[PDB]
Amino acid sequence: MESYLVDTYQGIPYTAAVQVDLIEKDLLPASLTIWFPLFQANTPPAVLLDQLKTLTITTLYAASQNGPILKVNASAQGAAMSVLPKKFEVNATVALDEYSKLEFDKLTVCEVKTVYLTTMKPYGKKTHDLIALCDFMDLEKNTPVTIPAFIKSVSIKEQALTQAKIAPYAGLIMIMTMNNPGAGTQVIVELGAYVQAESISKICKTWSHQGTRYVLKSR
Amino acid sequence: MESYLVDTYQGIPYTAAVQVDLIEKDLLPASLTIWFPLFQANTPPAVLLDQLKTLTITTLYAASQNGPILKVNASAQGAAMSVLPKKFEVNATVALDEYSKLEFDKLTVCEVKTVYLTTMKPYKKTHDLIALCDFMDLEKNTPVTIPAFIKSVSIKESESATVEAAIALTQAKIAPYAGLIMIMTMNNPKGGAGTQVIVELGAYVQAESISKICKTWSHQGTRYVLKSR
Ligand SMILES: [Ca+2]
Ligand SMILES: [Ca+2]
């Protein structure tokens, strides 16, 4: 019921990274940002997003061996929504004030306040590390920021222009696509979910990629 | 140089869970909360903390296959500090405003604002035994229930039950370790042995509030439930 698109890949089949800002339909509503397992899409992104705007999510707070989780169940209207992951578990790691607002074992329908789509390239002798230093400018604050991305590990015997974008996926992720040395290839750096759902939209629109420096570090 | 102790375990050898609130010593200082790999201690906790108050940490921002990390190197004064993990890597996951403050590949000494110590115990499926730990936020007067998975049990002639009985007391405490963790100890288990369950609450929190949460989140009680799978 409110969207934002980050288009890193424009292609016939592409990986879809979906993240949603939710709010519980109950008397102690918790606000949550969760993301879907990745899936493949063959329809235009602007068109997938519209269909995703009909998303209906149901969560249920549960315990698991690897900490507490949320058993998610989702639905949407549209042909392209047949491939949408319907039932998946997520780590119920929330802002500490939200823990009180998380009723255990109560199947609650959540209400989508924003739906984010990120397009990606479908997935399908040893020293020095090739690392890419992605340079950005926070236009809200006019303060630079450099996020390092590990690329390859090369061996040493005794790129010019690439694109980087801040996208909302595992909270926020930086995705960098290299054009040639190979070919179109993406590196994802996870920045973590520790952030206000409101600021997620803010960061993406204010963090402008300035340039990329490739460095080499002996191991 | 400030300290706080959470004594879940009191024993001859015990697991030490150390977490520190740091601030870089540079011209764009980043504030950081990192925790040490767990280690064993044989000296009193109040005594280990004193020695830990002499902690000197050096971080260096680096890239890794599993996102960006911080190459940590640490030292402290005192005999018990021989066992302290000296060189360890940590995930460099910070509050977003902090990313600008983190300088790539610049070896910076960090300054310890607070040292936290937490003591611990050294270490065909139908239903799940889950413990609902009940707490009260005294600052806000609002309850909070954190569910801990204990074990999977098998019931012959089984249904899909709820609340359970032994086979009544246990203690639970909110402690600063992987940011904040709830640690629950089963006194007279099935009523094996004294056994602890750690629930990770995540590092998503202001270093200041970490001290606040621990002092205000009081354990009210524990309900044992059963959930069919
Ligand atoms: Ca609720
Ligand atoms: Ca700095």
Numbering used by the authors:
A (entry chain A): 1 to 124, 138 to 171, 187 to 209, 217 to 254
B (entry chain C): 1 to 123, 138 to 181, 188 to 211, 217 to 254
Provide excerpts from the study.
In this study, we solved the X-ray crystallographic structure of the M protein from HMPV at 2.8 Å resolution. Each domain consists of a twisted β sandwich, in which the β strands in the opposing β sheets are approximately orthogonal to each other, and a few short α helices. CTD loops (residues 180–188 and residues 208–218) are not visible in the electron density, most probably due to intrinsic disorder in these regions. A unique feature of HMPV M among all experimentally solved M proteins so far is the presence of a Ca2+ binding site located on the solvent-exposed surface of the NTD. The binding pocket adopts the classic Ca2+ pentagonal bipyramidal geometry, with an average coordinating distance of 2.4 Å between Ca2+ and interacting oxygens.
The matrix protein (M) of paramyxoviruses plays a key role in determining virion morphology by directing viral assembly and budding. The matrix protein (M) is a major component of the virus, and is thought to form an ordered layer beneath the viral membrane (Battisti et al., 2012; Liljeroos et al., 2013). M plays a critical role in assembly and budding through interactions with multiple viral and cellular components such as nucleoprotein-RNA oligomers (N-RNA; Ghildyal et al., 2002), lipid membranes (McPhee et al., 2011), and cytoplasmic tails of the viral glycoproteins (Henderson et al., 2002). We show that HMPV M is a dimer, both in the crystal and in solution, and Ca2+ stabilizes the structure.
